[PDB]
Amino acid sequence: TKSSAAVALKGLQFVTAKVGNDGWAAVEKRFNQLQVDGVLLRSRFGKCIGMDGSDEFAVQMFDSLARKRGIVKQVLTKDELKDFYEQLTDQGFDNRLRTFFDMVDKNADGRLTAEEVKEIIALSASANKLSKIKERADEYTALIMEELDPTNLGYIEMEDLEALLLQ
Amino acid sequence: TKSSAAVALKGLQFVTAKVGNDGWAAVEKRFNQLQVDGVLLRSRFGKCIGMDGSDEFAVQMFDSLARKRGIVKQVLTKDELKDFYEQLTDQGFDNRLRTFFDMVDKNADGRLTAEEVKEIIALSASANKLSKIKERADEYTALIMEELDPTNLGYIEMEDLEALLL
Numbered sequence: 215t216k217s218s219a220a221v222a223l224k225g226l227q228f229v230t231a232k233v234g235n236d237g238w239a240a241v242e243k244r245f246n247q248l249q250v251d252g253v254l255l256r257s258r259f260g261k262c263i264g265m266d267g268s269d270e271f272a273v274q275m276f277d278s279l280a281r282k283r284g285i286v287k288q289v290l291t292k293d294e295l296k297d298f299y300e301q302l303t304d305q306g307f308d309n310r311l312r313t314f315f316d317m318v319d320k321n322a323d324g325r326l327t328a329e330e331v332k333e334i335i336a337l338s339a340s341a342n343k344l345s346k347i348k349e350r351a352d353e354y355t356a357l358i359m360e361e362l363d364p365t366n367l368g369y370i371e372m373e374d375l376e377a378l379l380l381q
Numbered sequence: 382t383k384s385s386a387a388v389a390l391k392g393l394q395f396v397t398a399k400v401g402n403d404g405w406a407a408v409e410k411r412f413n414q415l416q417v418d419g420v421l422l423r424s425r426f427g428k429c430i431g432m433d434g435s436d437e438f439a440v441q442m443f444d445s446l447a448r449k450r451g452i453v454k455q456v457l458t459k460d461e462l463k464d465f466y467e468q469l470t471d472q473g474f475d476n477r478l479r480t481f482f483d484m485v486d487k488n489a490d491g492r493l494t495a496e497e498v499k500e501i502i503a504l505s506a507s508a509n510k511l512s513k514i515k516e517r518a519d520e521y522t523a524l525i526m527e528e529l530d531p532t533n534l535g536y537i538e539m540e541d542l543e544a545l546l547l
């Protein structure tokens with residue numbers, strides 16, 4: 215239970231967060247921007263929904279949602295997109311657990327193998343460690359620049375790194 | 382200085398370590414095997430030098446040594462490769478610092494911007510834990526499994542989930 219229940223959760227929370235919780239007015243306006251002849255391409259699905267993840271993650275979510283609906287073209291109308299959206303913002307637990315399951319179940323057989331499970335466990339941990347690292351790096355950068363470029367050239371030079379290290 | 386120079390020190394050691402210091406015997410031998418029509422591909426520089434770190438680290442390193450020499454083709458003759466080897470193999474501080482600087486300096490303008498600096502700090506902090514995480518994942522996976530699939534059917538169902546978290 216203890217470490218396993220919390221690891222399923224970690225994975226759920228991760229997918230939920232990559233999808234995000236943008237309201238319909240923001241998703242629809244992006245649709246308006248992204249659509250061509252009234253239709254949203256598969257490749258723009260992540261951007262339309264306001265997703266956080268990789269391109270590949272966005273497209274795989276699209277296919278799991280399409281697959282579920284019997285949609286086989288790779289193009290969505292506003293009404294279809296809206297129906298994909300309704301599912302993804304239903305923040306109910308059953309609903310979220312369902313969408314997570316389908317997302318992690320890449321071959322859509324209604325089972326999850328050791329491989330599928332590890333896949334999403336690794337992605338989520340590693341993407342989360344990367345985001346954290348980039349916030350820190352950002353703060354370490356500001357400190358280096360603040361110290362080696364107090365006069366605000368917008369850069370530092372070789373000479374400044376020497377000094378920083380030889381000392 | 383303290384935390385500031387440690388941050389910069391650690392990026393310099395990360396790059397130094399990823400490059401390694403194989404002897405010429407080894408790298409020339411590897412060249413001979415990796416070479417095609419006399420030249421060595423950018424994509425094969427890492428393997429030839431014996432670096433660790435990512436394929437991306439290897440090609441960035443490559444590019445930085447090329448930029449320095451105005452080499453714009455993505456291929457090296459043996460001569461040229463040996464020259465790249467010689468700069469890399471010089472573990473004198475002056476030289477190591479230069480190589481580091483040029484690696485961080487993606488546009489070779491002799492200047493390091495905030496953006497360039499954030500990038501090696503991120504990478505020097507990131508690289509190592511990928512595998513460390515890939516290995517924690519296996520310990521979790523094969524623990525989710527040995528608990529949601531006690532008899533080892535090989536898979537988990539939605540209702541195994543339903544019951545897990547409810």
Ligand SMILES: [Ca+2]
Nearest residue numbers: 319323325326
């Ligand atoms: Ca499956």
Ligand SMILES: [Ca+2]
Nearest residue numbers: 486490492493
């Ligand atoms: Ca630069």
